[PDB]
Every structure is written in structure tokens, then in C-alpha cells.
Design a protein around this ligand. Structure first.
Ligand code: FES
Ligand SMILES: [Mg+2]
Ligand SMILES: [Mg+2]
Ligand SMILES: [Mg+2]
Ligand SMILES: [Mg+2]
Ligand SMILES: [Mg+2]
Ligand SMILES: [Mg+2]
Ligand SMILES: [Mg+2]
Ligand SMILES: [Mg+2]
Ligand SMILES: [Mg+2]
Ligand SMILES: [Mg+2]
Ligand SMILES: [Mg+2]
Ligand SMILES: [Mg+2]
Ligand SMILES: [Mg+2]
Ligand SMILES: [Mg+2]
Ligand SMILES: [Mg+2]
Ligand SMILES: [Mg+2]
Ligand SMILES: [Mg+2]
Ligand SMILES: [Mg+2]
Ligand SMILES: [Mg+2]
Ligand SMILES: [Mg+2]
Ligand SMILES: [Mg+2]
Ligand SMILES: [Mg+2]
Ligand SMILES: [Mg+2]
Ligand SMILES: [Mg+2]
Ligand SMILES: [Mg+2]
Ligand SMILES: [Mg+2]
Ligand SMILES: [Mg+2]
Ligand SMILES: [Mg+2]
Ligand SMILES: [Mg+2]
Ligand SMILES: [Mg+2]
Ligand SMILES: [Mg+2]
Lengths: 93, 120, 31, 78
RNA sequence: AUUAAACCUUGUACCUUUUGCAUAAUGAACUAACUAGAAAACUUCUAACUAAAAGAAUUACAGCUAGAAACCCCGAAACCAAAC
RNA sequence: AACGAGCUUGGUGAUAGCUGGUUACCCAAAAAAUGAAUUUAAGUUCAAUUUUAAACUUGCUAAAAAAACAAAAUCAAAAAGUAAGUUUAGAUUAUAGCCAAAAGAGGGCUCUUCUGGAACGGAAAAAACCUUUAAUAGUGAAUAAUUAACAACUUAACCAUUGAGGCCUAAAAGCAGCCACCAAUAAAGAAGCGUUCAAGCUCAACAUAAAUCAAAAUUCCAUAAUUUA
RNA sequence: CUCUUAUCUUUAAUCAGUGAAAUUGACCUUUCAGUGAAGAGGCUGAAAUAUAAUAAUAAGACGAGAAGACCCUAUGGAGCUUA
RNA sequence: UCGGAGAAAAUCUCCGAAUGAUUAUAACCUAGACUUACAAGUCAAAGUAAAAAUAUCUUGACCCAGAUAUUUUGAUCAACGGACCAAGUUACCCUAGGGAUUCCUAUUUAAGAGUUCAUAUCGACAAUUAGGGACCUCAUUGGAUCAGGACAUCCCAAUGGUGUAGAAGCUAUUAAUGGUUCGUUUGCAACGAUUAAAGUCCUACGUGAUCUGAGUUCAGACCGGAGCAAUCCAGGUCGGUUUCUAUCUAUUUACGAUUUCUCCCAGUACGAAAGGACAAGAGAAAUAGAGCCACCUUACAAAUAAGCGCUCUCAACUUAAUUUAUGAAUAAAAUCUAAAUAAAAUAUAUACGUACACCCUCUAACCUAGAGAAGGUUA
């Protein structure tokens, strides 16, 4: 229950998704020393980092491909407006 | 039963469509968020292949893809088995410092600062 | 004779049925 | 044989999601011509990785320490 | 599972066979014992020596020598020879 | 004491393309029933598939224009999404499917081609329909499909006026039959029908008032239920 | 036979002694409708239901047996006849 | 076996070839390809050589035998990937296996029939998403016993209509109540005499561990017809062996009646006569069910059991077709009402009755109680 409502509030549909309840550490030592990170959290972070790097890589490749395309199109323009040698006329040329 | 070619009119939006989904016909988004939400079992083999090519073997796990025609061409093949959502970057693209602090929201936003604290 | 239609096909017909517009007030009751 | 209320509602939901898929697929960031070659480098090096693994197959090194270590099985307290 | 053996819940015996299905169909009263994959032409793996290898006879334009690695059980109606 | 040809021993562990059986664990991959020849269709050999190892380089999808017939199977530069593919060496098994859906061909069935399937969930029970990426412990959670569904549109009570219009059946009356398609009027042509034909029972007028569809054979077979957002 | 009846003996049944046979996956072995290949004690949904014997019937367990019948197959046989 | 044409590449629709004549005589060699499981089969640049470019048109392996002086030739091997050379028959049979064991009828329509008059009784064209049944050839079902069920009703019962005067009939609705005979010739029918009627179907011929006749269908034997014979025929005929001790399930202790005829009403109502009713009422039987033994009969040449003897059998709260009364929608002095109401009216049935009802000693004997056990009786 409540999956659709949670999505509207910006939360994950399943309470076990991204949120304080799951991601926050489940315990710490009585001394206050932090506990070793949970294996699930470390794995989930690694996937998230991998997802971000793909986002950067794809954006950079597309943007470059756009900029590089412009430069090529410019060259074709200038190449067209090329003149050489001379233009004699008349009964002798 | 054979592969079908969808008429081009299907992918030409209408003015009200822009209003409903809130996407500007100019400044189009760059990256897709694609998730498989149906099974490839009982589907023709070509649909099975495109799903593997796009990386959507596991369901309900999002994959990022380029919003370019060649990628789009494959996505149109499996339009019925997936959900496409435009990736949003409220705080900009992640940098080296923020690479380890990202989180993809259900809304389609990749936030680069993830604190797990009350907004306050 | 009728030939049975696949469930999925029958489901499509069920969802594509014509829906007529309904008036707020019947014309008869109005002046 | 009529079609349930569950069955007709759920399909319409799927149709609406697919309807949105139509819209988001209508706004390509790059045109076809602009697309050419923007990812040539990555595709080239990727295959070079495939070839490198394929042609690197070879037997494994053999060591004396492995063979002579079997003698440790008869180690004792003198 | 349970506080509780049984009540409540879930669950169409097995092998072969059909077809990749049976509510088909074959076989099984049960216990103990006995009861059915065997060979090195080529290939692969491990070593010895190497333009040569092998303890005679053989092979050889990196080969040759040695080791390792393999291919079931039960069942007719019949046929023939010699006795009875 | 089983004679279409006795019995016993040996040949002999006869042969059987046929029936049956073929004994520990775990990991992995995995076809077919397409094609071809066969005294061959209860078999086998080859192709094709699959597989293991090895060598090195392009493969899959998609693929414009343009071509070969034509408004998608061949073919198929650049790309892009992706990780496979060709050759070398070795090797069996397999060669009879099943059901749903789609297009044809013969003529309901039966051939041919294309697609999918083989739940532990749902459809009642349910190999073949729908939902379902593998398989693990947990007294956590979000979800998918989900045998159920809400007959259909005006008489009211009234009034009906000739020379039988002729002619084929004496003569044929709104009116036997056929053709004119008829008479004044506030208002009426002759509608059923009556009549040998006219008997006339009296429709429309005048004259008064309102007015086409959409959930048979053993013994019925869950129980029930019209409204709480 | 209509239309069966009575009596006696055999068998039966009870007591004593002796003591087989085919058969048998396991059984804590129900009725109705459905589903299914003509098909259900065992599946689906209803229903019924203290537990064990003794003596009877034969609807069912496609009840059990025999070297029975029927069609087809094998590059399996055999008897007989010939042109 | 291969080739040509269509279907259009899976099986179907058609024609041809196992060559033929013409000829310029058409060489050798060698890149790259087609086709193809293998095998066989296609096309061909360049070079060389002959000549002075050209072959035009429309198919069988290996082995083994030959012929010439290297060169060549041998298949309706046509079952056409071809065994060097072999046919019938078996019901005397065997083994290894695989299988199986148009015409109704109900609806809709209505030209024409019915003197007149569509629908009293019927009925063309059709309509039902409607229910059942190469020239020749051809093969499970009766009976007995006991029956369960459907209703699409044969009789019995309640009704509508009529070309229903009465009596006989016809048609339709409702109803599954109990019943629905005995023989002859028969192998499927064919008849006789009766009846209120002698229904139509389903249950694996309903039912062979209940029984029985055929047939499938054989070992013997004849005719007729085939074949040289053995043998054979879906042609005749006569003869001709299937057994079972029940393990499981299931089952084995009441009922409250059907039909027919005669008498009466009454030879009346009706009807010209002929002929001839209904309801109401009384009495006889037949069959079924449940019992009994005074008589009769048959037995035990017993104190008993039987039928061929005797007796007894009934109530309906609850409905269907149909018919009335009151009365709205609907100005009626209408309308039986999937309006509110009041009644009558088949077959069914269990509301309502009858039966049962007791907690029960038992050494033993006896018993009209009984397989055992149970049960009854005991100055
Ligand atoms: S809605 Fe009833 S007449 Fe106006
Ligand atoms: Mg069988
Ligand atoms: Mg032999
Ligand atoms: Mg053998
Ligand atoms: Mg064989
Ligand atoms: Mg195929
Ligand atoms: Mg051939
Ligand atoms: Mg041959
Ligand atoms: Mg390419
Ligand atoms: Mg004894
Ligand atoms: Mg029991
Ligand atoms: Mg049943
Ligand atoms: Mg049950
Ligand atoms: Mg006993
Ligand atoms: Mg029995
Ligand atoms: Mg054969
Ligand atoms: Mg032979
Ligand atoms: Mg070849
Ligand atoms: Mg040349
Ligand atoms: Mg042959
Ligand atoms: Mg051949
Ligand atoms: Mg004989
Ligand atoms: Mg009966
Ligand atoms: Mg009836
Ligand atoms: Mg029987
Ligand atoms: Mg018996
Ligand atoms: Mg004889
Ligand atoms: Mg006889
Ligand atoms: Mg005799
Ligand atoms: Mg005989
Ligand atoms: Mg018994
Ligand atoms: Mg009377």
C-alpha cells in the first residue's frame, strides 16, 4: 500500500528504497565509535557512482560531437568560397 | 506476425502534449532514464535482443541512454516494455568531488548532494 | 458461427468502446 | 464472457505510460548527421580490449616450489 | 506448524514410457545378497631427448619416445551334427 | 502329458534395425523432429545444428539511398546500441514433436511458412493462454497478471350528404368484373367491408380536446449481497 | 412353462484339529456435480462422516487368471505348392 | 527416375524423354565461379594449336566382361544411388514387437388450400449463432433377471381452440404420477388375439467376476465359383471347451393404492332422426404393496411351511396450464393483477398423521426369535 502516494511526495515507492530508514547506519558502538559500513550500503554506493560516471561520459561525448560537427560544417562553407589562378577573357585567354 | 513500422505521426507531439508532460519542444533533454517494466517472455525474438542491447535485462533498474536517433530507433522497438523518463540535473552535472554523493530520485532528478537529513 | 477471440483481443475491444457525452440537464426538464 | 474491471483499468494505465513514451521519443537532442562519429574513439578501443583478451590465451607458469612443497606433507615434530 | 499425537493449512505415488501431458499404459508384496561400458587409428594432456627419437626391423621438412585418457547386460521362434 | 514335425547334448555367450534393464556427488553447456540417399521409411550415413580446445578479427541489431520483381524476405557504405564472429583440430546424439496465434494452399479436416509457450501466481481443476531474468536464509516491503458483469419510446370519441358512375353476367350502388376515378355543398373519396347488385355494419373529412436502440437423461450446485467517500 | 412350492441329503453356518491358491507400488481405501482420452476413492467446488467385527449381494476397482481374438511391423521364422 | 507448363515454394492440374534429325566437325590447356550432403552436373577470360570466328535447334555409378593400337564400347540395371542370379500359399501356423479391442423436429415468414375466410386443421420460396438421424467392393447385437433416470406424454389427471349440436374426433398448453399384455412365423420383420394404454429415448447390447442364443470366427467336412497346384471367397451349409474361493468401495429392516367395468342419474340433456352424454352417487373385480392359516389345495406318509386359499389399503398445509371477482395506471357503466388484491383449479409432496419409544436379569433350559451373536419366555 501507499506506493503511489509515496511517489508523489518525491520518495521511493517502496519504503526500502532511497531514504534515511535504509541508508542510515543501523547501529554504533556503545563507546560511540562508528561501526563498519554495511555491505548493502557499500554496494549501493558503488552502483550509484558507476551510474554518475556514465552520465558525465555520455554528456561529454554528445556535447563534443555537437561542437565538432559545427567546425566541420564551417570548413565546407569556406571551402566553397575558394578562388584561384586568374580569369582572362576575350578573343584571347 | 512480423516486425511493424510505426507511422511517423505517432512521434509528432501536439501543443497540448507539451503542456501535459511539461517538456519544451526546444532545448530537448539529453539523457533518457529507461526501465523495463514488462517481461520479454512471450515476446518476439527481436524484442528480446534489443532489450539485451540496451542493458535492460533486470526489471525496475534504471539505465541511462543517449537521446540520439540511433538509440531512439531501438527504443521504439521495445516502447511497450519500458518506461522512458527524462533525466534532470537540478544541481548540475556531477564533478569529481560530487561523484560519490549522488542519488537518482524517482522524479527523474540526479541530485549531487545526498545528506539523508530533514530539509529544515 | 461465432469464433472465440483471444482474451487480450477481447480486452482491447472492452477498453475501446464508444462513450457518449452526457448533458448536465436533460433538455426536457429545461424551459 | 465479460472483461473484469481490474483488467480494463490496468491496461489503460499501461497505455498512459506508453503514451508518454511516445512523447519523450519525439525530441532527439542530436540530428542524424550530427550523430556521425561522436563516439568513434570509445568503440575502437573497446574492441581492442576484446582482441587483447582473445589472443592472450596461453599455458600457465609452472614452479618448483609447488612440486617440492608436497614433501611438507610428511613434516613432523622431531 | 502448534502448548497439544490427531482437527487447521498446503500437496493429482514411483520408474520407464509416451511428446517436452496425463486421471494413459507397462514393471514393482516386502527384506537380505547377487545382478549390466571392454579395446588406443586420429585427437587432447604430462614428461625424456631433439634434426633426430626409439634397448635391431619403426617413424621424421620439429619430430620421435613413454605415460594418461574408450566403445554394456538379459530374452526368441529357428538352423545343423551326433546320440537316445 | 505342447509334433506343420520328437527329445537330449554339442555347435552356442546362435542372431534379434525389436521389448526390458543399465548401480555415488557437484558445476556447466545443450540441440533436433530441416534437407539428402537408402529392400529406406521401428534403422543408418552425410549435410545442417550443438559442443570442447586452439589461432586471430571483426560480428549482432540496425542499415540509407539503388538496385533484382515490387509500395519486404535478398542485397546492403557511413553511423550508433552493443560483444560477439570466422577459421583449425576432435566428437557424439539427433533426424516421429505438442498446443495457441497469424497468412496462404488444397478440400471441417489436412499440408506449407511466420511468431510464442512448457509456474511454484491467475484463469475453477488447467504441459501449450496471461503474469514471471537464475537460486539462497529472513515472523520485512513495494508490486504483476487476476470469471466476472450492471427491460430500453401516438386514438382520444366523435361522424358518414346523388345522378345504381358506367359496361359483360337482369342491372351491377364507394364497391360481381373492367374503365372513368365521379355530385352540389360550412363538409365526404369512396377505406375496410356490405351487397345477387342496393342490404349498408361504417374509415377519412366537417365538427372537438391532447399526442429506434445499448446486460435431456445419478443429485440444483460455494455461501451471500443493490450505496461509507 | 403359467408360478412356484414342500421334504430329505450335499454344501453352508457354529464348536474342535489340520491347513492351501491366484493375487498384493503404498493406502488413514466415501457420495454428487465438474474437468478429463468414452474415462476419478485420490484433482476443482459442494456435501457426508464415532470406532471395529460376523453373515450376505456383485455396481465398480477399464477386478484377477490362460499360450484367446483382431489389424499392422521385421530386409524374424517355418510348413505346403509349383509354371 | 529426370525434364517442360499451372496452382504461386508442401499435394494437386497437364505435356514430353530414355532422343531426334541437321551439319562448318566443335582441339589441347588453364584464372575465377555456379550448383551440391556425398556422388554426378554447369559457365568460362588468358595462353597454345588447327583452320580462315560457329556446332546449331529442340540421360545409369562401381565391379566385371569386351573391341581394336593407345583408343574405345557394353542396361525399361525403368524397383531408374543400380543385390551377378530366387515365385506363390498358410484357416496348421510360430517368435519379436506395435496398435486397437436427404430427413425429420422446434421456432420466424405466409403466396396459396380450406365454397366464403392466411394461420379451425395446414401450407410454396426461403429465414434459426436451431436440435437429430482406375473396372469392382464391404463388415457388434437379441433374450433372461433387476432395472436408475430424461420428458420431446402412450394411457390415467387439469385445461384453451374448433369447420366442437350430442357421441366420436382434431390441435395446443400443463403435468414424469403409476402403469405400459400374451403368442405365431421369424431372422429382421411378418401377423394373430387383447388392452385405459401396449410411449420415445439415455444409462459402454444399462446390466456376461448374474445367466444365455447369435456374430466376430478359426483346427474337421462338403457343395458353387475361382487357381497349374498348395490354397482361396467378407458366397452356401453341418459340427465344434473360458475359469474365477470377493481383498477394498458401495449395498442388504416400515408406511398413509393405481386402473378398469357394471348400476344409477337415464335411453334422459342434446338431437329431424340415427344415435346418445357430464358432474354427483353406489357396487364389483384386476394388479401392486403389506400380512395371515378358520376353510380349501399341495407337501412333510409330524405339531409345520406354501399358494392355487383368506384379509386389509387413507389424509394434502403447500401449484401450472387455465377460469372467475374487485380495481389503478388509462375520463371506461373498461382490464384476472411480472399493480396493490380475493378465489377456484392436474400430477407431485410430509407440513399433518400412524409405526417405533422401555436401558434392560441371565447358570441353564425352552421358543411360532435366530447362520453366529442378538431377542422372548421361566407358579
Ligand atoms: S426532469 Fe422530469 S420533466 Fe423535467
Ligand atoms: Mg495401449
Ligand atoms: Mg537365417
Ligand atoms: Mg542379443
Ligand atoms: Mg528396423
Ligand atoms: Mg524447420
Ligand atoms: Mg537424385
Ligand atoms: Mg536398392
Ligand atoms: Mg556497418
Ligand atoms: Mg477350524
Ligand atoms: Mg475411512
Ligand atoms: Mg463424475
Ligand atoms: Mg473433494
Ligand atoms: Mg467365518
Ligand atoms: Mg465387484
Ligand atoms: Mg525395413
Ligand atoms: Mg528373411
Ligand atoms: Mg561434389
Ligand atoms: Mg580464349
Ligand atoms: Mg530401391
Ligand atoms: Mg532409388
Ligand atoms: Mg478349415
Ligand atoms: Mg424405472
Ligand atoms: Mg411437459
Ligand atoms: Mg460385469
Ligand atoms: Mg461369486
Ligand atoms: Mg485340413
Ligand atoms: Mg452349429
Ligand atoms: Mg453333435
Ligand atoms: Mg459354424
Ligand atoms: Mg463381502
Ligand atoms: Mg356418473
Amino acid at each position: 500500500a501507499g506506493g503511489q502516494w509515496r511517489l508523489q511526495q518525491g520518495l521511493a515507492a517502496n519504503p526500502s528504497g532511497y531514504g534515511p530508514l535504509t541508508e542510515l547506519p543501523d547501529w554504533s558502538f556503545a563507546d560511540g565509535r562508528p561501526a563498519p559500513p554495511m555491505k548493502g550500503q557499500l554496494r549501493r554506493k558503488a552502483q550509484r557512482e558507476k551510474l554518475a560516471r556514465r552520465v558525465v561520459l555520455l554528456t561529454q561525448e554528445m556535447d563534443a560531437g555537437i561542437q565538432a560537427w559545427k567546425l566541420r560544417q564551417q570548413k565546407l562553407q569556406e571551402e566553397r568560397k575558394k578562388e584561384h589562378d586568374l580569369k582572362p577573357k576575350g578573343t584571347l585567354l | 506476425f512480423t516486425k511493424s513500422r510505426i507511422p511517423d505521426k505517432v512521434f509528432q507531439p501536439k501543443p497540448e502534449d507539451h503542456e501535459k508532460y511539461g517538456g519544451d519542444p526546444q532545448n530537448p533533454h539529453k539523457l533518457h532514464i529507461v526501465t523495463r517494466i514488462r517481461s520479454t517472455k512471450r515476446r518476439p525474438y527481436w524484442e528480446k535482443d534489443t532489450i539485451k542491447m540496451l542493458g535492460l535485462q533486470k526489471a525496475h533498474s534504471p539505465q541511462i541512454h543517449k537521446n540520439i536517433p540511433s538509440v531512439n530507433a531501438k527504443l521504439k522497438v521495445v516502447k511497450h516494455l519500458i518506461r522512458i523518463q527524462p533525466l534532470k540535473l537540478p544541481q548540475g552535472l556531477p564533478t569529481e568531488e560530487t561523484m560519490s554523493s549522488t542519488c537518482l530520485k524517482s522524479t527523474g532528478e540526479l541530485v549531487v548532494q545526498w545528506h539523508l537529513k530533514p530539509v529544515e | 458461427h461465432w469464433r472465440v477471440m483471444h482474451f487480450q483481443r477481447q480486452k482491447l475491444m472492452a477498453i475501446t468502446e464508444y462513450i457518449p457525452p452526457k448533458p448536465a440537464i436533460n433538455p426536457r426538464c429545461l424551459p | 464472457r465479460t472483461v473484469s474491471f481490474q483488467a480494463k483499468e490496468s491496461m489503460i494505465r499501461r497505455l498512459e505510460v506508453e503514451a508518454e513514451n511516445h512523447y519523450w521519443l519525439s525530441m532527439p537532442y542530436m540530428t542524424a548527421e550530427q550523430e556521425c562519429g561522436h563516439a568513434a574513439e570509445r568503440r575502437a578501443q573497446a574492441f581492442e580490449a576484446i582482441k587483447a583478451a582473445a589472443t592472450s590465451k596461453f599455458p600457465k607458469h609452472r614452479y618448483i616450489a609447488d612440486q617440492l612443497d608436497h614433501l611438507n606433507i610428511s613434516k613432523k615434530w622431531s
